Design a protein around this ligand. Structure first.
Ligand SMILES: OC[C@H]1O[C@@](CO)(O[C@H]2O[C@H](CO)[C@@H](O)[C@H](O)[C@H]2O)[C@@H](O)[C@@H]1O
Ligand code: MG
Length: 580
DNA sequence: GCGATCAGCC
DNA sequence: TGCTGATCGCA
């Protein structure tokens, strides 16, 4: 059963062919400045295992790694590329990434190792990483004999699976999606992660001290209002204090007990002064724990930078996700938490942060895909879409739109993109189902094309078994035929929402690729730092701001051509906060 | 370790 | 709608 391979003590020309499956193993989940525990190469000449200290010190091997004409097939090439960047070695020529290929074929499979991808094609001559390295506290690198065979088997699977995967991608019309979008983007993300974002730790440490003070006061007041001390962070102990000791009314329960969600507490605020304080405590504690302490734990002491990892093969819609830290959910709505962004600064003096965001890209994409005359005209006039929606559903002139009307029209617009549901809208606007239903019916009378799209996309999902995005990303929806109402309904909302959210993801990804190419052409020092779904954040010399003010929006607005214009807003300043 | 709870943004 | 991650409780 064992697989044959050469456990080489030195590198040979034989292992430097112009096409090969390459494995540069980094076991640590977070690959930044992490160890490369072994290398495996499989090509027309055979299978090889090389110790990293050997291969990575070899002039020939390193040159081969950096030679773009020498093609390599891999799994999660970004992980290897970044781990190599930290060692001052460039990886080029990656023409096929099995992780990205598997992700495009079916993001629902949750493929996270070679074994999982291989199983898609009935190939099982490779073990899952978890079985070899174990998990959690017991996750360790095995002895060389066990390690070497694993890396060789992974490289062998990659070598064998490339053709089958590329063939199915072609049939799905996703070959260009992999080769011209996801793979090139992978290299850009590697550069962004490696560059990192400079953090002002002193500023963070100072904010944390202020929060600590406020939490102290609010915490004491809470015990004062409750007549005793208890763990506020335990819904269990809070529930007894609120719904038992204070006799507050139970407006919602949870599988385990009483509900203490912010939405429920605000409705209880009028009854007791403790509720307001609990809410405030919830706010402060969130910033302190998740952002201040959480951010300070991942900043690198030597450079004062945070190096996030963009998971490119996780979301079911095509969006990127960010971890350690998640720089895609830094506070912005509330001012107190928004100030956390003052902590993100340029990596060099005399440099500034430049941020550009698409204005209502999802609604614009919807206007385009549904070809709704009213909605397309609205964006062609660059109207305030929420005010316009309010005018139509409530049948009033612009002057007649009140702040509450706009707020509700705004909530309807969000529902429409998420896959409208009279139940979900009702809960959100704190109104009845029938009323939420009335709003929805009114919306469809105003936007018949959108109604048509919603009906047709659900039908299509049932017919083909999946829905697609502008650049041909795909999402299978087997639950679309379920006889269970809740399960089937979720699938229907997914059918309505994916072409919208997914197409928006396709566009920003293409914009990143086009932008990176333009910056190089223009010889600008400016570079991408982060992406947050509908916005791109860069940093550059202060002398490049004027050129970026024209270049970035143009590149982003021209990424794709839709039936409606794409609009990009932009700002720049000394910190991320000031890039407003 | 792992669920159920909560809350941050898109 | 799509995410990450915190603290708690239990195991
Ligand atoms: O290298 C990122 C890439 O690896 C996967 C597993 O194949 O995720 C691993 O690394 C992430 C970043 O450290 C972790 O969040 C995740 O828990 C770990 O399994 C892929 O999902 C990802 O695309
Ligand atoms: Mg925006």
């Amino acid at each position: 059963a064992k697989m044959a391979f050469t456990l080489a003590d030195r590198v040979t020309e034989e292992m430097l062919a112009d096409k090969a499956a390459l494995v540069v193993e980094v076991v640590e989940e977070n690959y930044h400045d992490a160890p490369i525990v072994g290398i495996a190469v499989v090509n027309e000449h055979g299978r090889f295992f090389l110790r990293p200290e050997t291969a990575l010190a070899d002039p020939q091997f390193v040159a081969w790694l950096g030679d773009e004409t020498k093609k390599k097939s891999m799994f999660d090439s970004k992980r290897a590329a970044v781990a190599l960047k930290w060692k001052g070695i460039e990886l080029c020529g990656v023409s096929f990434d099995l992780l990205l290929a598997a992700y495009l074929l079916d993001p629902a499979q949750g493929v996270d190792d070679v074994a999982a991808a291989a199983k898609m094609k009935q190939y099982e001559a490779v073990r899952p990483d978890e079985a070899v390295y174990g998990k959690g506290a017991k996750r360790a690198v095995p002895d060389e004999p066990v390690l070497a065979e694993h890396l060789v088997r992974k490289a062998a699977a990659i070598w064998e699976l490339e053709r089958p995967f590329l063939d199915e991608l072609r049939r799905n019309e996703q070959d260009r999606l992999l080769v011209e979008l996801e793979q090139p983007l992978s290299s850009i993300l590697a550069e962004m992660e490696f560059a990192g974002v400079k953090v002002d730790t002193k500023r963070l440490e100072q904010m944390g001290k202020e929060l600590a003070e406020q939490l102290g006061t609010v915490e004491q007041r809470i015990y004062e209002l409750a007549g005793q001390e208890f763990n506020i962070n335990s819904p269990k102990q809070l529930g007894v204090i609120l719904f038992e000791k204070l006799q507050l009314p139970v407006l919602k329960k949870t599988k385990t007990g009483y509900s203490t969600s912010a939405d429920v507490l605000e409705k209880l605020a009028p009854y007791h002064e403790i509720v307001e304080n609990i809410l405030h405590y919830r706010q402060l504690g969130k910033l302190q724990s998740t952002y201040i302490e959480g951010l300070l734990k991942v900043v690198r002491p030597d450079t004062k930078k945070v190096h996030t990892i963009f998971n490119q093969a996780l979301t079911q819609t095509g969006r990127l996700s960010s971890t350690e830290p998640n720089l895609q959910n830094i506070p912005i709505r509330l001012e107190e938490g928004r100030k956390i962004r003052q902590a993100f600064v340029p990596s060099e003096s005399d440099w500034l942060i430049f941020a550009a965001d698409y204005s209502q890209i999802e609604l614009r994409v919807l206007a385009h895909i549904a070809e709704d005359d009213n909605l397309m005209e609205a964006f062609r006039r660059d109207l305030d879409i929420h005010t316009k929606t309010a005018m139509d559903i409530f049948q009033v002139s612009e002057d007649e739109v009140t702040p509450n009307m706009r707020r509700q029209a705004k909530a309807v617009n969000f529902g429409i993109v998420y896959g409208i549901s009279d139940y979900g809208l009702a809960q959100n606007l704190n109104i009845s189902r029938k009323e939420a239903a009335e709003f929805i019916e009114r919306y469809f009378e105003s936007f018949p094309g959108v109604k048509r799209y919603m009906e047709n996309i659900v039908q299509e999902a049932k017919q083909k078994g999946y829905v697609t995005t502008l650049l041909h990303r795909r999402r299978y929806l087997p639950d679309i035929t379920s006889r269970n109402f809740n399960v089937r309904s979720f699938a229907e909302r997914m059918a309505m929402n994916t072409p919208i959210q997914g197409s928006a993801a396709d566009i920003i990804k293409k914009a990143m690729i086009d932008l990176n190419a333009r910056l190089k052409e223009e010889r600008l020092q400016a570079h991408l730092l982060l992406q947050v779904h509908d916005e791109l954040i860069l940093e550059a010399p202060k002398e490049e701001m004027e050129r970026l003010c024209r270049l970035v929006p143009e590149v982003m607005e021209q990424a794709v051509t839709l039936r409606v214009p794409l609009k990009v807003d932009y700002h720049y300043g000394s910190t991320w906060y000031d890039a407003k």
